[PDB]
Amino acid sequence: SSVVGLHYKIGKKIGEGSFGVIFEGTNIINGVPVAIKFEPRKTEAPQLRDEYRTYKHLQGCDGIPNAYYFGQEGLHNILVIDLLGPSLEDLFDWCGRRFSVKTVVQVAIQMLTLVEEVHRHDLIYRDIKPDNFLIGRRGATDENNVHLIDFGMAKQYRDPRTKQHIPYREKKSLSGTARYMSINTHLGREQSRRDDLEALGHVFFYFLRGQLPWQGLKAPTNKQKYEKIGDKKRTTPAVTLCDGLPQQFAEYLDSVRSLPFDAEPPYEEYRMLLLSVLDDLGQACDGDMDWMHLNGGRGWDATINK
Ligand SMILES: N#Cc1ccn2c(-c3ccncc3)c(-c3ccc(F)cc3)nc2c1
Numbered sequence: 001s002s003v004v005g006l007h008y009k010i011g012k013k014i015g016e017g018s019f020g021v022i023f024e025g026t027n028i029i030n031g032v033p034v035a036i037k038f039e040p041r042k043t044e045a046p047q048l049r050d051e052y053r054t055y056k057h058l059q060g061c062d063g064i065p066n067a068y069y070f071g072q073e074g075l076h077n078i079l080v081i082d083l084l085g086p087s088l089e090d091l092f093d094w095c096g097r098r099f100s101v102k103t104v105v106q107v108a109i110q111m112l113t114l115v116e117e118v119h120r121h122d123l124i125y126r127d128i129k130p131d132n133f134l135i136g137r138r139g140a141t142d143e144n145n146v147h148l149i150d151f152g153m154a155k156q157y158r159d160p161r162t163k164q165h166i167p168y169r170e171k172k173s174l175s176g177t178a179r180y181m182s183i184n185t186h187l188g189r190e191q192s193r194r195d196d197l198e199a200l201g202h203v204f205f206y207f208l209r210g211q212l213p214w215q216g217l218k219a220p221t222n223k224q225k226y227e228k229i230g231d232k233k234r235t236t237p238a239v240t241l242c243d244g245l246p247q248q249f250a251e252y253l254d255s256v257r258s259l260p261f262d263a264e265p266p267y268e269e270y271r272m273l274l275l276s277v278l279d280d281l282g283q284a285c286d287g288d289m290d291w292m293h294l295n296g297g298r299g300w301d302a303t304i305n306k
C-alpha cells in the first residue's frame, strides 16, 4: 500500500531539508499535487508533530501552505501540505548566483510581510534561509508569490493570552546555518523578533553581492568556524556591505541590529524603506523578477538548470 494519508499517493522523491524525507504526492480525490514529509517515529529528534500544529496556527495566511494531514503510517510520521515551486536559493543559482536590485527589493517586502505574519501569531522562525522561501508552481495564481515553509525551528516568543515576551537569557548552543544567523545568535542570546529580521538583512546582501564576506572561512572544527563567522559579522559595518549598493540596505541592517529585545519592529517602515529604493532608480514595483527571463522566457527548466 503505497498511498499514505488515506487520500495522498506517493509520487517523486525530492527530499532535502536536514536529511528530512520529503516527497511529491497527489490527492487522488482531486489530483492536486502535495508535498509529503516523512520522519521516523523512534528517532532521536521528534519534530514533525509540532510542525503540523505550526501550519494549522498560521492557516489561511498568504504564503503559508495549508496543513492537510498528519498520520501514523507504518513506522513513519507523515505530514501533507501544499507542494510549491523552487526555493529562492534554487532560482538564485539559476540566475547566475546574483539577483538584480529590483528583484531583491520586491522579494524583501514579501519576506518581511511573511515574517511579520509569523510574529503576529506569537512565533519566531529562527531558521531564515533562502532554501526555505519558495515560489508557487507554474500556472497557479501565486506562481511567483514567495511562500514560507519548514517550521521545525519555530519557537514561541510571547504567550497568546497575555502577549508577554519570554525573558532574556543566554547559554544556548549555536544551532542552524551560521552564514545567515544573527550576531546575537552567535553570542548565544535568546532569539526574538529582531533576529528574524537581521537574518533577513544578511539574505538581502547575500542576494545582492552573490556572496558574503564571512563565507568560505576556514577553521579546525565548527565552533571556531561558527565563531570565526561571528567576528567578521561584527568587524564589517553595514556600510561596507552596501558598497556600490543602495544605502537603504545598510540602514535596514543597522536599524534591525539596534532593536531592543522585546520591541515590536516597525515592519512597514522597513518595507517602505526598501520601496524607496525603487524610487531612486526609476523602477516600477510591478512584480518582474530575474527568474522570469531564463530559457528564452519560458521560465525555469529542470534538466538544464537543476
Ligand atoms: N532546503 C530545503 C527545503 C526545500 C523545500 N522543502 C519543503 C517543500 C515544501 C513545499 N513543497 C515542496 C517542498 C519541505 C517540506 C516541509 C514540510 C512538509 F510537510 C513537506 C515539505 N521542506 C523543504 C526543505
Ligand SMILES: [Cl-]
Residues within 6 Å of the ligand: 179, 214, 215, 216, 217
Ligand atoms: Cl559558508
